[PDB]
Ligand binder design. Sequence first.
Ligand SMILES: Nc1ncnc2c1ncn2[C@@H]1O[C@H](COP(=O)(O)OP(=O)(O)OP(=O)(O)O)[C@@H](O)[C@H]1O
Ligand SMILES: Nc1ncnc2c1ncn2[C@@H]1O[C@H](COP(=O)(O)OP(=O)(O)OP(=O)(O)O)[C@@H](O)[C@H]1O
Ligand SMILES: CCCCC[C@H](O)/C=C/[C@@H]1[C@@H](C/C=C/CCCC(=O)O)[C@H]2CO[C@@H]1C2
Ligand SMILES: [Mg+2]
Ligand SMILES: [Mg+2]
Length: 1217
Amino acid sequence: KPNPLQDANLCSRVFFWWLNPLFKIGHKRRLEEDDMYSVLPEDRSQHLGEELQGFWDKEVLRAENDAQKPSLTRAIIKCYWKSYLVLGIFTLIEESAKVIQPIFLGKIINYFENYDPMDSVALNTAYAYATVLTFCTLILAILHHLYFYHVQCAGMRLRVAMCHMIYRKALRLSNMAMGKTTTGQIVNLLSNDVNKFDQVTVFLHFLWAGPLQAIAVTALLWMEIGISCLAGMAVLIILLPLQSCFGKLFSSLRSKTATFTDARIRTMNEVITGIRIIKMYAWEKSFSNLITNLRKKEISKILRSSCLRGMNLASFFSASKIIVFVTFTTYVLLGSVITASRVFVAVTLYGAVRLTVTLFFPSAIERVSEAIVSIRRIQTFLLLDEISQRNRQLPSDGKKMVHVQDFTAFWDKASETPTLQGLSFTVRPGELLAVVGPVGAGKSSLLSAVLGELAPSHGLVSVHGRIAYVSQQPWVFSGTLRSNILFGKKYEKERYEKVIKACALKKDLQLLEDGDLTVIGDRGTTLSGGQKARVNLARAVYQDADIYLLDDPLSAVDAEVSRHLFELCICQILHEKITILVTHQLQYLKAASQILILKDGKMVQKGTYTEFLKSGIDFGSLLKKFQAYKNYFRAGAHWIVFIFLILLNTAAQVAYVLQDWWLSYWANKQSMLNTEKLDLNWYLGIYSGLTVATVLFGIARSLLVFYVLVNSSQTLHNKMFESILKAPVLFFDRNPIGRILNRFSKDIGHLDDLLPLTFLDFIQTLLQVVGVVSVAVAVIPWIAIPLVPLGIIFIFLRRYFLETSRDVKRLESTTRSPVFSHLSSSLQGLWTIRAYKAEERCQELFDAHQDLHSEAWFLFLTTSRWFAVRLDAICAMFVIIVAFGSLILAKTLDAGQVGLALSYALTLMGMFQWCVRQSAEVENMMISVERVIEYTDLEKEAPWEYQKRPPPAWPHEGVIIFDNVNFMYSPGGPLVLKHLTALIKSQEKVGIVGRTGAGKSSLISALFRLSEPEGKIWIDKILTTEIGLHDLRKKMSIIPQEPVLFTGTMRKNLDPFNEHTDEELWNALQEVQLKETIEDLPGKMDTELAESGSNFSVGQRQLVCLARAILRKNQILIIDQATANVDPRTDELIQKKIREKFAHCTVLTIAHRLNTIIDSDKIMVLDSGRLKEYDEPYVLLQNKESLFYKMVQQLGKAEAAALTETAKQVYFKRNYP
Ligand SMILES: Nc1ncnc2c1ncn2[C@@H]1O[C@H](COP(=O)(O)OP(=O)(O)OP(=O)(O)O)[C@@H](O)[C@H]1O
Ligand SMILES: Nc1ncnc2c1ncn2[C@@H]1O[C@H](COP(=O)(O)OP(=O)(O)OP(=O)(O)O)[C@@H](O)[C@H]1O
Ligand SMILES: CCCCC[C@H](O)/C=C/[C@@H]1[C@@H](C/C=C/CCCC(=O)O)[C@H]2CO[C@@H]1C2
Ligand SMILES: [Mg+2]
Ligand SMILES: [Mg+2]
């Protein structure tokens, strides 16, 4: 994609003529990610990232070099001052040509001031000054566009480089660093807190050309009107401190808001992710009050951070109206009198200094004080504890091997007991090491140790070769399943077929519509747990490495699938490769070449299974211990308040214009004078009333617009949140977590503190354009004749540019999400990415994502600054007409009227494109109001509570009956359950088993009405559909497959509704034996449980859930594969404690482990979604042809026999006491 910019001369690069071809493309057909141009090789993400990383690395070096001052990313000005000063030339020429052109305004009004007789030489001089004024407003809207384009691209370079290096760090930060922060925080850096660099640079020059021009203004205004000018500049002085405690105090409010914003976003992430869990526990009205409190404490710091940009845009808008007022109050109270060349050169000078001192200077201060917090937090991030850069690979003897000697390491060094102590093992090619132990032993810690992800406190690890790592939790990332398996490796048909056949994925692909090409959704919500594990194992296998760190890929699959994987995949493909296997399945230890047993970081014994038999040690014992705009504004205040707002806007603009006209009328009344004097009391009285009516109306308008438009983003959010809290879970299945959290972070942020500001800005500058055009028309009515085509051209320019910039903005907004998505995905699988030496490849992929979004942003900037240059050409045509349609029609105009008209036409420039380029941006951040309204009308779930509530003690018995119940995930979707009729009596324990995909969890889903069932489900003769969702769900406890601990106190992970006392909480913890585990923490009830569940043991949080159940005392407990990733220790304690506690409660257990279910009072066997056998496990073992007995036998002969007598004993003891 050749960029025309590198093939564009200066003439066509100033006016962006080179972009005209692209526009010709977009006018007809849609623009897509291919039409864009590749960014210039000077500004790919890689070059920018490398440059700024070199500078910041030299900076962290310098900080730790003879200085010992802390490092400073904001002192990487050193990398942009050379190229972001050459942009100061444009500012210096522009803001010294906005002081020059007022002189020529005075000299063109002087023509009318003296007279306009039949004097050709004076009229020719006026023509010359008008031509000079025109070419000074053309060479001033080219230095306003070259500067304001190149500054936006010099801020884009900083944004892109900073994003690139945030990735380059987030790809190299150690375990502790990933513990201190989260993926939410890093993506917040990359998305919401690096964007500040697109705006820090824009106004950064007017920090010096703000005050400087002010001085110049006085240095040119004294010479006109004497000491009086000081007074005006005096009230200019007061603005700079006052309007900088509006840009630092505002930024203080903004950073004090951002903590509430991210607390709300994180809590919404909890809600969106564990929404299934929240529905099942009926916690909805408990996070309805934890976002309604991190919002109403947020919308108290937005009605103060926006009523402080109201006082900052109403101190800009009415800045020169105060400055001119004070100036001429002093100027006439000092004895002088008003002539409309002093006054209007003063007006157009004080306007040009209003723009810079009162807007660009406080905007620069605010952008710098809002980007300094961004830089501060990005240097907080960039100084995190990065992983130890892999020690130089010593000259190897070519022998690929793993060698671990006296290994000792801490996951957290502050912990007293090390994670591992004194591990020592050597693995040579062809050797299968199987790692066994209890829950929390450190087997995955061991594989991390071989990975180098666990820094040794003592001991040595020497690992040589390509390492393929399967994590204990399978990593499933966005992309096709074939691309998931490839992981960037080249696709080869035969070996891929062999691996898939080995990984038992052939049938799974066959039952899919698209087979292996199916696009797997985010986080693997389209797949099952066993499917995710198989995908992960296949991904590792395909890379055909040397050393394979397998972290128990068999605990997520049934017995037959796990045996298939161990035999065909592990024992055949990995028969010649170095392999370390973590396993809780003892059944494979007989086939392991070598075994290492680990307990509490103790290598208990290392050897072959035969040597372990010879010692007589039992392994079980070892393991047992327009409508959008109406819906937007009306969501704010009543339409009467909007009428008041329109009246207030159009009174502020009429007074801002009537003040200038009053100076003009005063000047005309002074011209036609004489003794005779002018009633100065009256004139200053009216001229002060107009200034006060401008100031107060500007303030009132800028506060009312913000109050209304923040009052709609407090209503749109409160009206969209309450709908996603009631969206049937099908909604969360279809739309990922990211696509729902985005419209609660990005879109609500836009509605909160970027749409009110953009919209008030657009309203205010549109009204000033209306004021300018109205002044010109009322002064030179003939202008209405050339203003008809001059508008039509604009009508054909807004169209012809919105046929493309509706697409380029679309490309940018849709290719911005691949960057963050790839960050999140590459950050979940970070350990796997560093396992392979694939840091550079992921760098290339992320720089390609950033390059694509840089192409999109480059076209956005250049199309906007093509639009703006043509708009300013139209606006200079307007200025030409006013400045020359006053000379050809000189004999008709006063000298105060030409001054008024021309000093308004001159201010049209630069302001026109900003009321036309914000409309095209108001209606683009208003398509983030289709999105926010999109979920305020979603199909809500069934009513939460019907009026006919169940009895308070219901269900007192606990009988669950199915009558011809069919479950489909979506209406008309494939049936997962088919014609179910069953009966579970009071307190009866029934397991539910089948192959992966048998309909197991789907019965749960139909029980909770996750998708509404056809059929009849009876609970103590109560139909499920006849009772509200919360009356039901609060009456069935559940332990899902992956229990979730939500951030905050353990109190709110147990009782965020506070329906109990601390006594019951401690009773529950002592009933889950977690009283001692948490009491050791300083926050016994209030430990800062952080998130993601990487700071707890896998097998313990499932206990908290039953403690939750213990609080709620439900007769119906529903367990869904709880002890799947747990050793026999908790794999017995949970069930025995349940039998002691849920003996009186109907238990509904789903699991693959037949040991955990062998004593179930009944079993529901599901095959492909139908209830095949419903009879006690002993009878199902009686039928030799039963699938249940086959599942038992597939585990091995002795183990199947053991299950046989176990079920036999349970049956006989139950039935024949
Ligand atoms: N970031 C971390 N990642 C993993 N384990 C951690 C981490 N921080 C602390 N730990 C400790 O690791 C243990 C939990 O994981 P561990 O390595 O013991 O699992 P495992 O032995 O592989 O098997 P399982 O987790 O299934 O019991 C606990 O002792 C916990 O305190
Ligand atoms: N998020 C989802 N949306 C729609 N369908 C799904 C989703 N996840 C899984 N499925 C499909 O629904 C079918 C029924 O799943 P079911 O509820 O039986 O899971 P399960 O048998 O409990 O899983 P496992 O056996 O691994 O515990 C499966 O074949 C699966 O492919
Ligand atoms: C908090 C600041 C929000 C508004 C400031 C605005 O980002 C100004 C920036 C410059 C504009 C100058 C326009 C002049 C009048 C602006 C009117 C206004 O800002 O309310 C255009 C030329 O470069 C850019 C676009
Ligand atoms: Mg493990
Ligand atoms: Mg399941």
